[PDB]
From a paper:
The mammalian [name] (reovirus) σNS protein is required for formation of replication compartments that support viral genome replication and capsid assembly. In the case of mammalian orthoreoviruses, two nonstructural proteins, σNS and µNS, initiate VF formation, and σNS recruits viral RNAs into these compartments. Our crystallographic and biochemical studies reported here provide a mechanistic understanding of how σNS forms filamentous assemblies by linking dimeric units through domain-swapping interactions of the N-terminal arms and further how such a multimeric association is required for the RNA helix-destabilizing and RNA-annealing activities of σNS. An important finding from our studies is that mammalian [name] σNS has RNA helix-destabilizing and RNA-annealing activities without requiring a metal ion or ATP, which makes this protein an RNA chaperone.
We observed that the native σNS-[name] crystals, without Se-Met substitution, crystallized in the P41 space group instead of P65. Native σNS-[name] crystallized only in conditions with bile acid derivatives in contrast to Se-Met σNS-[name], which crystallized without these additives. Structure determination of native σNS-[name], using the Se-Met σNS-[name] structure as a molecular replacement model, showed that native σNS-[name] also forms an antiparallel dimer, with two bile acid moieties bound to each subunit in a groove located near the σNS C-terminus (sites 1 and 2). Binding of bile acid molecules is mediated by hydrophobic contacts with residues Thr 107, Glu 110, Leu 111, Ser 114, Gly 203, Leu 204, Tyr 240, Glu 242, Ala 245, and Glu 246. In contrast to the Se-Met σNS-[name] structure, the N-terminal arm is disordered and not observed in the native σNS-[name] structure. Instead of the distinct helical assembly in the structure of Se-Met σNS-[name], native σNS-[name] dimers crystallized with bile acid show sheet-like packing. Further examination of the structure showed that one of the bile acid molecules occupies the same location in the core domain as the N-terminal arm required to form helical assemblies, suggesting that bile acid competes with the N-terminal arm to disrupt the helical assembly formation observed in the Se-Met σNS-[name] structure. First, the σNS crystal structure shows that the free N-terminal arm displaced by bile acid is disordered, as the electron density for this region is absent in the presence of bile acid. A fascinating finding from our study is that bile acid derivatives bind to the same site in σNS as the N-terminal arm and impede the RNA chaperone activity of σNS.
Residue numbers in the entry:
A (entry chain A): 19 to 217, 232 to 366
B (entry chain B): 18 to 217, 232 to 366
């Protein structure tokens, strides 16, 4: 069974199975783990770089042109949620990294100023791996970022926000939203850090350098973009009876959505409050009830996060009150 | 464990004899060999070293001990280990061309002696393809990462071999020249070599040829040729090295390893071809001391008759066989 087929992150494939008169739900969320694998760019493109330029040509000529086809082309996706945040600065960021001009930079972000954040993230991630998806359906070779080769030995990644405790960098809880990091000239990304690991621990800002500075910022942006794509599909799924009613009584799907939102719970305030609530209800909530938690999570009043002191322990992001642990975030695979 | 050839790169080994049920069992480790062939996948060769900062090199350089293992890490000429003089002139100007570095300190890789360590050279060029330039001073400098090195980093198996034309059709041909004789004539003899990479998906390295990737193809082939030369140089020296050979003289398990090692270059080097052929004839049950007598005959065209041997490529394996018998089976190299 297909769940959310016209969606980049929420595209799923569930398989109901009856064994010994006990039902078992096995969920597959390939689009999500495909988009998070952008955190290791060389691995994201390691198989596609050998398919050849032919790959793109076949997708473009097909008349159906579904969202999965348009995502592979790093193009705006009709029939799927899109955004407008800092589209002006997003387009000139394409033109800066790829050294391409304005006229056909509009072909990624049109005059509508609407783009698919994950389709944008795919474009920039492939560029860091050395492949530039062009306006025409072609692969063009661009310089491979050193940072992308540095990080390709890592298997675990943990983004989080930081602040100063007096000459010491300490984790701070997400107060802004991920979208609000794309403005002010992307200068809000300096307060984000991804801790890569091999399970040895290496923070991405520890590797900061004049040579690697550009690669650091793009990689952070792609994570922010994948977070926006996630919010946009989570927001749209709520107002989508067609798909939500299909998974309405699949409680196993709540752990997956929680697992997914957990990825951004350290950098997005809405995903922070959303995951907190579901840990309170012990993650045993039917899908339809889950999205009311997603919809309340949009209000600063929904959970009391001010009294929550967070600490970083053994590659896990702990958010906990003195009484008990409220939320454990685990590093995302690849 | 017990150390074998500790002042060598490709042949550095560590053996541990263990007696179980009053039966002795030998466990052999040849780290230097599999470290040098891992250069066939450059990004993987440097995937762990790129995280260590330049301070690493300084710690090894400041040491006055200056052993061969230390000097290999510095991509420097190695005293106390065999070195070569073949096309040293063109090897140095190839350093200066790829790294855009000048002549004066290009001599510091290949001195006025014109002696160099082929594996130290292979390490220098392999690290460059992974984006890191080992400098004359102990420092890591960032150089453009070769696209080809990223292309090949999904592959797990590699099989070098020599090629020829069958009338508009590329066919495998047996090694008639030595690997060294592929570094001369401006390195134009490498156009007859091909490496079939695979994921066991099969991709020949010349299928990926392009103006953008042309340099990367040639450097990767050269490093394989260089690692083969390093192997010959240590194999030649081991024969006249009683100190080490007598320690492992009766270790028949060591014969499979040397055969497994020489098999890697048996497809592009004529000497390694005849050497591996011989040991397959004696069913690979040869004591180490006798093995290196076979290695010494292998240097002569007359030792085995290879002219009647038609070679073919079967499911990613290099078959050399005629009549009704498989004379040599070469398997793809891991990583
Ligand atoms: C954490 C502090 C700011 C003080 C603070 O805690 N405010 C949080 C807040 O903005 O609310 C910031 C400001 C200057 C930053 C550095 C500079 O921008 C330079 C450089 C930029 C790099 O993107 C990440 C490393 C770092 C050293 C940055 C680390 C860190 O990002 C710093 C040292
Ligand atoms: C932070 C990185 C890298 C900076 C650098 O080269 N190192 C400086 C250092 O190490 O001191 C830069 C590279 C190109 C920049 C972008 C481009 O110039 C285009 C555009 C320019 C605007 O003034 C600010 C937004 C932004 C998207 C820029 C954001 C950000 O400013 C980028 C993505
Ligand atoms: C095998 C044939 C030559 C016929 C032959 O067998 N003569 C051997 C001989 O020279 O004695 C050569 C000539 C043209 C070569 C190609 C061109 O030089 C272009 C290009 C050059 C690259 O170095 C390796 C790949 C290849 C496609 C080459 C593959 C292969 O190297 C070819 C197709
Ligand atoms: C074959 C490759 C790549 C050629 C290329 O850019 N593509 C051409 C194409 O695709 O037609 C070149 C790049 C630099 C060359 C070397 C440098 O020029 C230095 C030096 C120059 C000598 O004339 C011949 C030996 C060699 C080592 C050269 C061997 C070989 O000639 C190299 C290693």
């Amino acid at each position: 069974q297909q769940v959310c087929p016209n969606y980049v992150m929420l595209r799923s494939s569930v398989t109901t199975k009856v064994v010994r008169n006990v039902v078992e739900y096995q969920i597959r969320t390939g689009g999500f783990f495909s988009c998070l694998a952008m955190l290791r760019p060389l691995q994201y493109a390691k198989r596609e770089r050998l398919l050849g330029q032919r790959n793109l040509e076949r997708i473009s000529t097909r008349d159906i042109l579904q969202t999965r086809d348009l995502h592979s082309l790093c193009m705006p996706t009709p029939d799927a949620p899109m955004s407008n945040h800092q589209a002006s600065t997003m387009r000139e960021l394409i033109c800066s990294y790829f050294k391409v001009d304005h006229a056909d930079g509009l072909k990624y972000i049109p005059m509508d100023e609407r783009y698919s954040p994950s389709s944008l993230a795919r474009l920039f991630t492939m560029g860091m791996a050395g492949l530039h998806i062009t306006t025409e359906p072609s692969y063009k070779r661009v310089p491979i970022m050193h940072l992308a080769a540095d990080l390709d030995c890592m298997t675990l990644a943990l983004p989080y926000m930081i602040t100063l405790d007096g000459d010491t960098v300490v984790p701070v809880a997400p107060t802004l939203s991920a979208e609000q990091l794309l403005d002010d000239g992307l200068k809000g990304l300096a307060c984000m850090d991804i801790s890569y690991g091999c399970e040895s621990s290496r923070c991405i800002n520890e590797l900061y350098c004049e040579e690697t500075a550009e690669a650091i910022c793009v990689l952070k942006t792609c994570l922010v973009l994948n977070c926006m794509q996630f919010k946009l599909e989570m927001d749209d799924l709520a107002h989508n009876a067609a798909e939500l009613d299909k998974i309405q009584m699949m409680i196993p799907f709540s752990e997956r959505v929680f697992r997914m939102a957990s990825s951004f719970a350290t950098i997005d305030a809405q995903c922070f409050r959303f995951c907190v609530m579901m840990k309170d209800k012990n993650l045993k909530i039917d899908m339809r009830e889950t999205t009311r938690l997603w919809t309340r999570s949009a209000s600063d009043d929904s959970v009391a996060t001010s009294s929550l002191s967070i600490s970083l322990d053994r590659g896990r992001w702990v958010a906990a009150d003195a009484s008990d642990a409220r939320l454990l975030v685990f590093p995302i695979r690849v």
